[PDB]
């Protein structure tokens, strides 16, 4: 039998469980004595989908409120030791994820090459140095990619920056966060914001990618978009709202406001932050996309991803300018995003990706974003009726994530999703579909998991329904547990913490970095009702094995925001 | 009953031990099997100095050569699992240490300030941006410090660069190392080389330090030297040979030589070899003119001699000019003359002329021997080579011999020291009453420079019994850093168990892939052993001695595990 727990441990006042794999009671042992301090019943959870992990039982020990080190015991079997602590993830992992970012900054020969990279199909070159390498196996740099699939665009570099700046603001009133940490976090954020600036063309649009076809060659780097697993380059590099640009604009607009925060004056200075520069860039970008967005989209049509990205842009632009103009912009985008919530014979209030909702929204990087954008909007909406209607849509959407996760046996509380394959029907699932508009792409979903963690914690301060708040706290903690080793693989996917950290291709020089997070677990390669991580048939196949162990900066960035929102809410009675 | 092992594991063909602390025989258990593959006797060991750790037993499982995961069991006590593998530390930790250096680059507001730092005592500003923060609690950047004590100067930033470049060279003939690792390694090395360039004045001397009085303030950063625990600044910032400048010249000269290596034209490129070599020569010939004037007591000592030997040897390899061979011989003769004998030891290293003050060094005690081995690669004259080999053999014997003088189950590398008001004596740890009047700390960088020495010797000497004892000494000192110590504490952050932190409550968190100062003697009892002892653990004036990270430890560990990798098939 096997006892599975969060490898690091549990937030002191958080929801707490362990999962037993076996063929009637558990004890909690205080490590100090080795004596049982609480007895708990086993709750059978039965079989999951076609995971074939056998029988499972959950052990609920939420009532354990007292800090220290502990183990779970069932019969002759014991879990590994874990910690119960206030601010546990913030205290133990936040610094390491910052060092991860700093370790992944574009530098050396790549930085040298990016000061003069060719623009695809032209003989011009541009200075786009800065930012971060995208992945443990990829020194390219991205606003987004998968644009040709239309519904799959992940927010990549700009999301890192918006998440870091968002975390910086949440931590501003935290007395226990040191100013040296603020120096480190705002440095990483503004380093990213400086890259966003360089990625902006004088007409106002942003470049989508600096892409080397995965070759690691300096001469091959080029500003472009690309398609397919073979990385066919194209001149379609103007980034539309859903292609990283709306988040970039939101990020620049938030950067422009750092002056409003007391820490900004207080910490050591060298010259002044570039505030007007960031604000002016974000405005120019925003208005240029209001005119041009359609022409930059692969199918010429805006979808839910444009509308959430543009809602963040317009919300941050309103916050930084206080101009009614941007609040009208935000209201318009909120209304379009709200109209994506729909109902059908399977689900009430799912998210639609397209206009008639025959294609559900699902998203392996950022499925919490529709809700997070409505919550950022609610922080600015002073009109009582607009606020109430929006709160109803938000509450529906939070109930949808909880209803779908709880629809089937799910001891791990893996966040479920409503999906559709290109040649399949709408159905609920644990993991994204393998047969999708890209024709190849799917991978572990840690960033999506951390985005839904961030949404569940952000709801705590936004919604009014205590019972939903309380279900969301539980949901957020089981999501967090999964990333940190409470999963069928007993595998902590935050490198440097916990046990069984997976690598990528260290034998080829492509080692995962401490502080980073990997793609993670997917469905089976042959069986989509299954579960897999580096399955034996494909584990050595370089065309496939990146789907599991490779690190990718959005997982890190979403994780960093997730734990910061957990820290904000850690005293939530 | 506690069973102590290397928390990571053991090189496949290395020396392998565990240490049982109790008041039987042992089994090795294959994890995969759940059952015993070797049965081994416990050798009893006495009490150690005054560490008060009870009685101990060692278990030698060297014979185990099958890659896999194992545990040790004695009675019902089990060790944690550990790994046996070929090139274990290289495959498991080398990448992390490079990420640690990149995470420690001077950046943001400090980089901005360092483009216009004032020279102490004047209003002249200079651009000395780049390099690395020296420690997890210090954003100052250093060639060296402690210059006022004369005998304690550590090689800091320059040593990172020379170690990485030397590692890059060792790895050139290793087919299993990937080119992308080469890209990353040489990038961090030449990043450091670029900083060494900016730290050189037009006249040819290097600045010793960019120092903020530990304030973290951008306004307080200035080019200077400083003295005492209060960090009083002075305008004595010209670096003599022992104050980082010898090794910086060595590093610049090595950097100029990269195009001789086939990987350098093979790997991706974009964008200074003659510039590095010109700086090295200029710095060298400058200090052959000015050195004594930059030294606090105006007298050169063993440290100048090993740092200048490194400089001149590298300059000879990069230029093939005879005067540089002549220079190396001269420094090699000076260095060799520091090996002295007295009533306590044959063939100890003397810091001063008469040997009344022995050499001991918390950052770099392997350097006298290393610099002679470097010199041995270039010496074509048979009788000089032969005389040098014997002094190097006597030095290597001295290290083994002093280490085993006394009960030492952990094989902690011992040393010949002298306190300012005391007599010459062997000890485990450096003395607390020394010429600085305050400074002493864990010795991880020293430990790893002696690992580096032990493995470098494998290719240099001829004596197979000494080669053999060196391999064993090297693996035991490796074990100590990685958790086979009385604290059951791995000091490489992100690996093993019980990693120590520094001051995370104040935002000075230790970094993954870095190595902390480590274990010392007791605060009150220098015959004791301590790490964050109760009485001083929360006192910010004292606790940096244990948990703080410092870049020489990581740089010496990086080179040590690369020399182990070179020698990993040496039985
Ligand atoms: N271009 C790829 C992405 O498609 C992938 O999602 C990421 C993480 O594996 O690696 C980048 O190299
Ligand atoms: N100036 C101090 C050193 O003297 C000390 O050796 C190192 C590591 O603790 O920290 C630096 O901040
Ligand atoms: Na486009
Ligand atoms: Na000097």
Distance of CA A41 to the CA centre of its chain: 34
The closest alpha carbon to B7, from B517, B337, B488, B556, belongs to B488
Contact indicator for B368, B302 with CB cutoff of 8 Å? yes
CB B441 near ligand 2, within 6 Å: yes
Q: β-pairing, B77-78 with B68-74?
A: antiparallel
- Going through A23-88 in order, the beta strands assigned E by DSSP cover 25-30, 35-41, 43-44, 55-60, 68-74, 77-78, 82-85
All residues with CB under 5 Å from ion ligand 4: B 236, 238, 294
Contacts of A463 (CB under 8 A, 6+ apart): A391, A394, A395, A398, A469
Ligand 2: centre distance to CA B525 (Å): 22
**Both tokens of residue B546?**
């244990």
Ligand 2: centre distance to CA B550 (Å): 7
Q: Could you report how far apart the first and last alpha carbons of chain B are, in Å?
A: 33
Q: What is the 3-state secondary structure (H, E, C) of B187-235?
A: HHHHHHHHHHHHCECCCCCEECEEECCCCCCCCCCEEEEEECCCCEEEC
**Both tokens of residue B136?**
């997890």
Q: β-pairing, A77-78 with A82-85?
A: unpaired
DSSP characters over B256-299? HTGGGSHHHHHS-----HHHHHHHHHHHHHHHHHHHHHHSTTS-
- Which letter does DSSP use for residue B79 in this model? P
Q: Cα–Cα–Cα angle for B25, B28, B31, nearest 5°?
A: 145
CB B556 near ligand 2, within 6 Å: no
Q: Which of A109, A181, A268 sits opposite B268 (nearest CB)?
A: A109
Contact indicator for A114, A128 with CB cutoff of 8 Å? yes
A501 interface with B at CB cutoff 8 Å = no
DSSP characters over B289-325? HHHHHHSTTS---HHHHHHHHHHHHHHHHHH--HHHH
Contact indicator for B565, B158 with CB cutoff of 8 Å? no
Contact indicator for A425, A418 with CB cutoff of 8 Å? no
Q: Provide the Cα torsion B105, B110, B113, B119; round to 10°.
A: -70
The closest alpha carbon to B428, from B60, B53, B79, belongs to B53
**Both tokens of residue A447?**
């960033």
CB contact under 8 A, A99 and B512: yes
Which H or E run includes A316? helix A304-321
**Both tokens of residue B123?**
């209003």
**Both tokens of residue B112?**
């901005």
Torsions phi, psi for B528 (to 5 deg) = -85, -170
Angle between helices B551-566 and B464-481 (to 10 degrees): 140
Contact indicator for A97, A515 with CB cutoff of 8 Å? yes
- Which letter does DSSP use for residue A119 in this model? B
The closest alpha carbon to A565, from A406, A374, A325, A372, belongs to A372
B33: exposed, middle or buried (Cβ count in 10 Å: 0-12, 13-18, 19+): exposed
Q: Which atom of ligand 1 is nearest to the CA of A552?
A: 8
Q: Cα–Cα–Cα angle for B542, B547, B553, nearest 5°?
A: 115
B396: exposed, middle or buried (Cβ count in 10 Å: 0-12, 13-18, 19+): buried
DSSP characters over A422-466? TTS--EEESS--SSSTTSS-----HHHHHHHHHHHHHHHHH---H
CB A445 near ligand 1, within 6 Å: no
CB A10 near ligand 1, within 6 Å: no
Q: For the range A425-428, what are the long-range contacts, defined as Cβ-Cβ under 8 Å and sequence gap of 24 or more?
A: A426/A344, A426/A346, A426/A358, A426/A360, A427/A346, A428/A346, A428/A347, A428/A404
Ligand 2: centre distance to CA B374 (Å): 28
Contact indicator for A361, A355 with CB cutoff of 8 Å? no
**Both tokens of residue A169?**
């603001």
Give the closest-approach CA distance of A267 to chain B in angstroms.
9
Q: Which of A180, A268, A507 sits opposite B508 (nearest CB)?
A: A180
Give the closest-approach CA distance of B180 to chain A in angstroms.
5
Torsions phi, psi for A117 (to 5 deg) = -85, 140
Method used to solve the structure: X-ray
DSSP characters over A357-390? SSSB---TTTTTHHHHHHHHHHTT---HHHHHHH
Distance (Å) of CA B128 to CA A271, B198, B200, B221, B399: 17, 5, 9, 11, 39
The closest alpha carbon to A463, from A380, A370, A396, belongs to A396
**Both tokens of residue A425?**
């029907």
How many other CB atoms are found less than 10 A from the CB of residue A536?
8
CB contact under 8 A, B504 and A95: yes
Three-state DSSP state, A24: coil
**Both tokens of residue B393?**
């053999």
CB B548 near ligand 2, within 6 Å: yes
Q: Counting ligands in written order, which one lies closest to the CA of residue A137? A: 1
Query: Nearest C-alpha to atom 10 of ligand 1 is from which residue?
Result: A135
Q: Which of residues 212-231 of B touch A (CB under 8 A)?
A: 216-219
Structural domains of chain B sorted by starting position, each given as residue range(s) with its CATH number in brackets: 1-87 (2.60.40.10), 88-571 (1.50.10.10)
Instruction: Give contacts of A177 with chain B, Cβ < 8 Å.
Output: 507
The closest alpha carbon to B145, from B223, B244, B235, B220, belongs to B244
Three-state DSSP state, B160: helix
Q: Mutate which of A137, A138, A445, A544 to test ligand 1's pocket (most atoms within 8 Å of Cβ)? A: A138
Report how far residue A18's alpha carbon sits from residue B443's, in angstroms, rounded to the nearest whole number: 42
Ligand 1: centre distance to CA A8 (Å): 28
Ligand 2: centre distance to CA A342 (Å): 61
Q: Which of B180, B181, B187 sits opposite A107 (nearest CB)?
A: B187
Report how far residue A305's alpha carbon sits from residue A237's, in angstroms, rounded to the nearest whole number: 18
Q: Which atom of ligand 2 is nearest to the CA of B137?
A: 12
Angle between helices B157-171 and B551-566 (to 10 degrees): 20
Q: Which of residues 172-191 of B touch A (CB under 8 A)?
A: 176-184, 187, 191
Percent helix / strand / coil, chain A, rounded to 5: 40, 15, 45
- Which letter does DSSP use for residue A77 in this model? E
Torsions phi, psi for B490 (to 5 deg) = -85, 130
The residue length of chain B stands at 571
Ligand 4: centre distance to CA A496 (Å): 41
Distance of CA A168 to the CA centre of its chain: 17
Q: β-pairing, A82-85 with A9-11?
A: parallel
Q: Cα–Cα–Cα angle for B132, B135, B136, nearest 5°?
A: 110
CB contact under 8 A, A180 and B95: no
Q: Which atom of ligand 1 is nearest to the CA of A547?
A: 9
Q: β-pairing, B82-85 with B9-11?
A: parallel
Q: Could you identify the residue written with the tokens 């022992």?
A: B242
Report how far residue A274's alpha carbon sits from residue A186's, in angstroms, rounded to the nearest whole number: 13
Contact indicator for A305, A313 with CB cutoff of 8 Å? no
Report how far residue B560's alpha carbon sits from residue B167's, in angstroms, rounded to the nearest whole number: 9
CA contacts within 13 A on the Cβ side of A180? 16
Report how far residue A369's alpha carbon sits from residue A384's, in angstroms, rounded to the nearest whole number: 23
Which residue out of B217, B218, B495, B507 would a mutagenesis test of the A interface target, given it has the greatest number of A Cβ atoms within 10 Å?
B507
Chain A residue nearest residue B269, CA to CA: A109
Report how far residue A438's alpha carbon sits from residue A140's, in angstroms, rounded to the nearest whole number: 19
Q: Which of B103, B109, B505 sits opposite A183 (nearest CB)?
A: B109
A514 interface with B at CB cutoff 8 Å = yes
Instruction: Give contacts of B549 with chain A, Cβ < 8 Å.
Output: none
Q: For the range B41-45, what are the long-range contacts, defined as Cβ-Cβ under 8 Å and sequence gap of 24 or more?
A: B42/B74, B45/B407, B45/B409
How many other CB atoms are found less than 10 A from the CB of residue A273?
16
**Both tokens of residue A97?**
């994820």
Instruction: Give contacts of A95 with chain B, Cβ < 8 Å.
Output: 504, 509, 511
Q: Which atom of ligand 1 is nearest to the CA of A231?
A: 1
The closest alpha carbon to B470, from B481, B459, B480, belongs to B459
Query: Nearest C-alpha to atom 12 of ligand 1 is from which residue?
Result: A138
Q: Which atom of ligand 2 is nearest to the CA of B549?
A: 8
Report how far residue A1's alpha carbon sits from residue A5's, in angstroms, rounded to the nearest whole number: 14
Report how far residue A148's alpha carbon sits from residue A151's, in angstroms, rounded to the nearest whole number: 9
Q: Provide the Cα torsion B197, B199, B205, B207; round to 10°.
A: -160
Chain B residue nearest residue A503, CA to CA: B92
Q: Could you identify the residue written with the tokens 């200048």?
A: B308
Contacts of B312 (CB under 8 A, 6+ apart): B284, B324, B327, B328, B330, B331
Torsions phi, psi for A36 (to 5 deg) = -70, 125
Q: Which of B103, B218, B270 sits opposite A112 (nearest CB)?
A: B270
Report how far residue A127's alpha carbon sits from residue A118's, in angstroms, rounded to the nearest whole number: 9
CB contact under 8 A, B108 and A217: no
CB contact under 8 A, B107 and A112: no
Distance (Å) of CA B279 to CA A424, B167, B255: 68, 22, 11
Q: Could you identify the residue written with the tokens 């450091």?
A: B192
Report how far residue A169's alpha carbon sits from residue A561's, in angstroms, rounded to the nearest whole number: 11
Contact indicator for A284, A222 with CB cutoff of 8 Å? no
Contacts of B108 (CB under 8 A, 6+ apart): A183, A187, A190, A191
Angle between helices A466-483 and A446-462 (to 10 degrees): 160
CA contacts within 13 A on the Cβ side of B318? 26
Q: Cα–Cα–Cα angle for B202, B203, B207, nearest 5°?
A: 80
Which H or E run includes A253? helix A246-255
The closest alpha carbon to A225, from A206, A244, A209, belongs to A209
Contacts of A506 (CB under 8 A, 6+ apart): A512, B91, B95
CB contact under 8 A, B218 and A268: yes
Resolution value, angstrom units: 1.9
Three-state DSSP state, A562: helix
A41 interface with B at CB cutoff 8 Å = no
Contact indicator for B79, B182 with CB cutoff of 8 Å? no
**Both tokens of residue B384?**
């000089």
**Both tokens of residue B36?**
């015993």
Q: Which atom of ligand 2 is nearest to the CA of B146?
A: 4
């Amino acid at each position: 039998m096997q006892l599975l727990t969060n490898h690091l441990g549990y937030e002191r006042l958080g929801a707490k469980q362990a999962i037993l794999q076996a063929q009637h009671h558990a004890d909690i042992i205080c490590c100090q004595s080795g004596q049982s301090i609480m007895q708990l019943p086993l709750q059978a959870c039965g079989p999951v989908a076609q995971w074939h992990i056998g029988d499972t039982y959950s052990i609920d020990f939420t009532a354990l409120n007292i800090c220290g080190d502990y183990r779970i015991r069932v019969g002759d079997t014991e879990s590994a030791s874990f910690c119960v602590a206030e601010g546990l993830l913030m205290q133990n992992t936040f610094s390491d994820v910052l060092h991860y970012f700093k370790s992944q900054r574009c530098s050396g020969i790549y930085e040298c090459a990016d000061k003069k990279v060719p623009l695809f199909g032209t003989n011009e070159t541009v200075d786009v140095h800065g930012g971060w390498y995208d992945a443990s196996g990829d020194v390219s740099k991205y606003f987004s990619h998968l644009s040709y699939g239309n519904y799959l665009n992940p927010q990549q570099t700009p999301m890192v920056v918006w998440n870091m700046l968002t975390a910086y603001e949440v931590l501003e009133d935290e007395e226990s966060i040191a100013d040296f940490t603020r120096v480190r976090l705002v440095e990483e954020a503004l380093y990213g914001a400086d890259f966003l600036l360089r990625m902006q063309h004088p007409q106002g649009y942003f470049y989508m990618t600096v892409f080397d076809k995965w070759s690691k060659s300096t001469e091959q780097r080029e500003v472009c978009a690309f398609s397919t697993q073979d990385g066919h380059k194209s001149a379609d590099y103007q980034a539309g709202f859903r292609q990283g640009a709306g988040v970039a604009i939101a990020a620049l607009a938030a950067a422009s406001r750092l002056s409003n925060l007391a820490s900004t004056s207080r910490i050591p200075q060298c010259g002044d932050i570039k505030a007007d520069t960031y604000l002016e860039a974000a405005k120019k970008g925003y208005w240029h996309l209001k005119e041009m967005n359609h022409q930059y989209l692969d199918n010429g049509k805006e979808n839910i991803i444009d509308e959430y990205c543009a809602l963040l842009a317009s919300v941050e632009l309103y916050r930084s300018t206080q101009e009614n103009n941007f609040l009208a912009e935000a209201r318009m985008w909120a209304d379009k995003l709200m109209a994506r919530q729909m109902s059908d014979h399977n689900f009430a209030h799912y998210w639609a990706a397209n206009d008639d909702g025959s294609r559900p929204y699902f998203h392996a990087a950022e499925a919490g974003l529709p809700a997070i954008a409505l919550m950022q909007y609610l922080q600015i909406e002073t009109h009582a009726q607009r606020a109430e209607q929006c709160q109803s849509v938000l509450l529906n959407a939070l109930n949808f994530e909880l209803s779908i996760t709880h629809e089937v046996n799910n001891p791990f509380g893996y966040p479920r999703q409503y999906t559709k394959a290109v040649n399949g029907d709408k159905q609920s699932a644990f993991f994204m579909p393998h047969d999708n508009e890209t024709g190849y792409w799917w991978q572990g979903e840690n960033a999506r998991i951390a985005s839904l963690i961030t949404m569940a914690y952000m709801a705590q301060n936004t919604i009014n329904d205590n019972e939903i708040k309380s279900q969301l706290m539980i949901y957020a903690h089981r999501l967090t547990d999964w990333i940190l080793g409470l999963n069928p693989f007993d595998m902590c996917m935050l490198d440097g913490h916990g046990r069984n950290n997976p690598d990528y291709l260290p034998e080829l020089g492509f080692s995962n970095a401490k502080g980073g997070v990997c793609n993670g677990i997917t469905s089976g390669f042959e069986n989509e009702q299954g579960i897999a991580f580096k399955p034996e048939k494909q584990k050595d196949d370089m065309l496939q094995n990146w789907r599991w162990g490779e690190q990718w900066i959005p997982h890190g960035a979403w994780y960093l925001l997730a734990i910061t929102m957990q820290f904000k809410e850690r005293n939530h009675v």
